[PDB]
Design a protein around this ligand. Structure first.
Ligand SMILES: CCCSc1cccc(OC)c1NC(=O)N1CCC[C@H](C(N)=O)C1
Ligand SMILES: [Zn+2]
Length: 138
């Protein structure tokens, strides 16, 4: 679990959005596993506007932050799960690092701010949904 709170927006993994997120929907994209909902209070986060490929992410299954080198946002095949059919997920960045089901929503940050959130993983990999191209969040 986890979310980004910026301005009057809450960014979450689309597959973990709540009834409240859908009732206050701003934008969603199943191909990116992202959903943004509106909030009444001002958020705590700021968004990176950069091309960093190194950063640090929070891994809830280890209660720890890990440094990572991650690929540029791209279209990557993601196998079927209880949440989605087998498909290509766009704007996804992969890295070698631990992750397991439950780690989605953990934030990835570089020196400039929030880069994205954990969205996929497996066998020593962790995938992050990029949010740096969503300029309207600011
Ligand atoms: C219960 C799923 C076990 S596979 C796994 C194994 C290790 C880490 C994992 O995520 C952090 C995952 N989970 C996973 O990749 N997805 C399941 C939820 C929806 C994700 C998506 N964006 O399509 C894909
Ligand atoms: Zn950066």
């Amino acid at each position: 679990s986890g979310a980004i709170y910026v301005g009057n927006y809450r960014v979450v993994n689309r597959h973990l959005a709540t009834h409240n997120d859908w009732a206050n929907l701003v934008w969603e994209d199943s191909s990116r596993d992202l959903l943004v909902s509106s909030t009444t209070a001002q958020g705590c986060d700021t968004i990176a506007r950069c091309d960093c490929q190194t950063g640090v992410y929070y891994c809830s299954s280890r209660r720890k932050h890990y440094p990572v080198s991650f690929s540029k946002p791209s279209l990557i095949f993601v196998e079927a799960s209880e949440y989605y059919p087998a498909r290509y997920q766009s704007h996804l960045m992969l890295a070698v690092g631990h992750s397991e089901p439950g780690d989605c929503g953990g934030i990835l940050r570089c020196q400039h701010g929030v880069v994205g959130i954990v969205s996929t993983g497996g066998n020593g990999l962790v995938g992050f949904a990029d949010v740096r191209d969503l300029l309207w969040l600011d």
